[PDB]
């Protein structure tokens, strides 16, 4: 099936508590496989997956070096952006960066991504053509012109189309037993009288894919939360009560070819 | 694998 590799970077200063905190994590689809934290003692890229620990030392060295370069880049960026938005010094501010790629069932290049946010808001993003940028506000337009003259998209393009997919492929080939799991989820439902009115909920659990919850006529508005992880590798989620006593159907997943 | 070439400052 389709797959994706994502890196998430976060940098946040403090009012007067030294250097900024820096966090980086790597995900294959929905499985975290690497981590980095500036406040961590190792000061190195650590494994977060089973089949990722078989990589050689030169790999772990390279990644530790590069992620540290990202930190230094963000270290600089934080100073810059505080000026762009004319923000105070004692204020704590956040920089988020994410990039990655997608592939098809044939494991060939599909999509590439690269995005950037300051204080939770979009700052700039590489367009789908991977040849142009989208500035959020006029401040970001400065950065745009800079990277256009700097041919940044050209560099990032080479990475996403090439390196990113190649190693994503390498990753799948090694974590096959663990990563390509679409084992069927668990369902079941609860029920509890509230007298004339009784509680009813729809539960879904134990599903490795994260993507996912009603008919009497399907209606919106009323219906409501986000998917939750289990911590082991699976996920779970639930979704309405109506004043009745004599009950109705709940509603499709990838690991299943449902109503009960 | 991380970006070895492409990371620039804003």
């Amino acid at each position, epitope marked *: 099936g389709s797959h994706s590799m994502r890196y998430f970077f976060t940098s946040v200063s403090r009012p007067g508590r030294g250097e900024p905190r820096f966090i980086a994590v790597g995900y294959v689809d929905d499985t975290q496989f690497v981590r980095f934290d500036s406040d961590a003692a190792s000061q190195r890229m650590e494994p977060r997956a089973p089949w990722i620990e078989q990589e050689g030392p030169e790999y772990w060295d390279g990644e530790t070096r590069k992620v540290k370069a990202h930190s*230094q880049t963000h*270290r600089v960026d934080l100073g810059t952006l505080r000026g762009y938005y004319n923000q105070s010094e004692a204020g704590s501010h956040t920089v988020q960066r994410m990039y990655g790629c997608d592939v098809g069932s044939d494991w060939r290049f599909l999509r590439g991504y690269h995005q950037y946010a300051y204080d939770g808001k979009d700052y700039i993003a590489l367009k789908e053509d991977l040849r142009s940028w989208t500035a959020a506000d006029m401040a970001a337009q400065t950065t745009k012109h800079k990277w256009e003259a700097a041919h940044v998209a050209e560099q990032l393009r*080479a990475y996403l189309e090439g*390196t990113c997919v190649e190693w994503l492929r390498r990753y799948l080939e090694n974590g096959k037993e663990t990563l390509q799991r679409t084992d069927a989820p668990k369902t079941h439902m609860t029920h509890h009288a509230v007298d004339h009115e009784a509680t009813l909920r729809c539960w879904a659990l134990s599903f490795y894919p994260a993507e996912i919850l009603w008919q009497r006529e399907d209606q919106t508005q009323d219906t409501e939360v986000e998917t939750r992880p289990a911590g082991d590798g699976t996920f779970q989620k639930w979704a309405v009560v109506v004043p009745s006593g004599q009950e109705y159907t709940c509603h499709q997943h990838e690991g299943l070819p449902l109503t009960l | 694998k991380l970006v*070895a070439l492409g990371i620039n400052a804003v």
Partner: T-cell receptor
Amino acid sequence: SMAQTVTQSQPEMSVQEAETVTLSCTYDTSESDYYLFWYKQPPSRQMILVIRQEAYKQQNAENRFSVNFQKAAKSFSLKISDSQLGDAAMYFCAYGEDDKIIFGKGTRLHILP
Amino acid sequence: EADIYQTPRYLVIGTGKKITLECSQTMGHDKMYWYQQDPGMELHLIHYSYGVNSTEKGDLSSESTVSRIRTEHFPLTLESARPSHTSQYLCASRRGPYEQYFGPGTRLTVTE
């Protein structure tokens, strides 16, 4: 600190004026994305870019200065046709990423008039 | 036109003294590097900066120190001169991953 990336085997080299000479350079990296450079440093000790090869830029792309880029073999020699006396200098093969550029020990070229 | 400058080109100084080499740049480059060149002409990265408020170690010793508060300036300091500091010191600037542009250089000799 000095990592073992670039290798320029011959530190000194000699060629008759005019004619052609080739400066070998191999490297060992774990990355797929990187730039390659050749630098010239005359007696004036001024470093001068000779050529930039982008690894993802398909194959080579100047004058008497040619290059043989073998991505699979990780070889990156510098060919200089019709060696002028003015070309006599130190020549450095270089490996570059976002963080920095890593230079080889360099080769000294002597042009014989 | 934009270029890169650093002074002096030459300098002799007594041992056990503080040194300061200024490196100027007008190409608007965010990245800057300092290299020492041996009498063997081998290049050793001393320090570098991704931009303002960024400083990165090449010297594992504390003999050298830098500080980048302006984009156009990247001075290099040596608190106490040593004979082994006798060498050539080259500054460079860099757009992105592209080639870096070197200055004229600074020739140093530390004498007892």
